[PDB]
Design a binder for this molecule. Structure first.
Ligand SMILES: Clc1ccc2c(c1)N(CCC[C@@H]1CCCNC1)c1ccccc1O2
Length: 271
């Protein structure tokens, strides 16, 4: 019934995540995204009360209620692929393209965006999900509402308190303990990736490209950035996992005070 229930539109993008198309739910005209993944390229499987990709398990765990995560609406199995039906904000732009187009973000805008990402990541952790690929390309902006939404749980895992020794996320957002030892814990690795993201936001590019820079952990600013924002970044990017802030500590940091709500953010910065 997939073919009769959704009208397929243009291809939005393709990559390690598969191929994603614009779609409309025929029942009520709801904008959707339709994501196809070949079965042979699914390395990571889990189970429902049947055998599904882990991405479906993780999405179901985070798609209850409202959150800053793009929600799984339905899924289908085909003989050689799985098809996922996801929310699609309209109009929308991913944060990578937004930053590529507009350059380094004003701190007020970065503060609003970063705050929303923190809230979304807390939501995932609350639901027992570790994203493991937090980055600009996995954040969508609802341009009218100023609301950010996390995508792509394809490298994610169940959250646990023991060590992870596997990683299939983005290397330049990966922490020094992974580079050096192939070992990390969930929350502290997530905080590292958040430091990279925040730098990316306020500087318009990522801080490290090579392994040696990651391991050295020295952050240089190319752009004028406030002392308070530089401090938070350097704290998230502490070389020792135990020296990094908790999410609570990030959200109580001086730089994170007086965040704009999403709608005000869109009025000032996006309209
Ligand atoms: Cl609109 C929209 C809804 C839901 C989406 C996704 C997009 N995408 C992203 C599609 C590729 C981007 C589109 C914009 C230009 N840059 C490339 C996605 C990518 C990977 C997993 C889930 C996803 O779920």
């Amino acid at each position: 019934p997939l073919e009769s229930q959704y009208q397929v539109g243009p291809l939005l993008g393709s990559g390690g995540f598969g191929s994603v198309y614009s779609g409309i739910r025929v029942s009520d005209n709801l904008p959707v995204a339709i994501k196809h993944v070949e079965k042979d390229r699914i390395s990571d499987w889990g189970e429902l009360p049947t055998r599904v990709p882990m991405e479906v398990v993780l999405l179901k765990k985070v798609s209850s209620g409202f959150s800053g995560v793009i929600r799984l609406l339905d899924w289908f199995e085909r003989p050689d692929s799985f098809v996922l039906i996801l929310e699609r904000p309209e109009p929308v732009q991913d944060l990578f393209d937004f930053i590529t187009e507009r350059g380094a973000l004003q701190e007020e805008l970065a503060r609003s965006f970063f705050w929303q990402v923190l809230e979304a990541v807390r939501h995932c952790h609350n639901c027992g999900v570790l994203h493991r690929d937090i980055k600009d390309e996995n954040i969508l902006i609802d341009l009218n509402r100023g609301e950010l939404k996390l995508i792509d749980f394809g490298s994610g895992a169940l959250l646990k308190d023991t060590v992870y020794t596997d990683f299939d996320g983005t290397r330049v957002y990966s922490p020094p303990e992974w580079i050096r030892y192939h070992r990390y814990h969930g929350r502290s690795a997530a905080v590292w990736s958040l430091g990279i993201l925040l730098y990316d936001m306020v500087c318009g590019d990522i801080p490290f490209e090579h392994d040696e820079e990651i391991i050295r952990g020295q952050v240089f600013f190319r752009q004028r950035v406030s002392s308070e924002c530089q401090h938070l970044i350097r704290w998230c990017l502490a070389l020792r996992p135990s020296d990094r802030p908790t999410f609570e500590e990030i959200q109580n940091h001086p730089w994170m005070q007086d965040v704009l709500l999403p709608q005000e953010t869109a009025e000032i910065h996006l309209h």
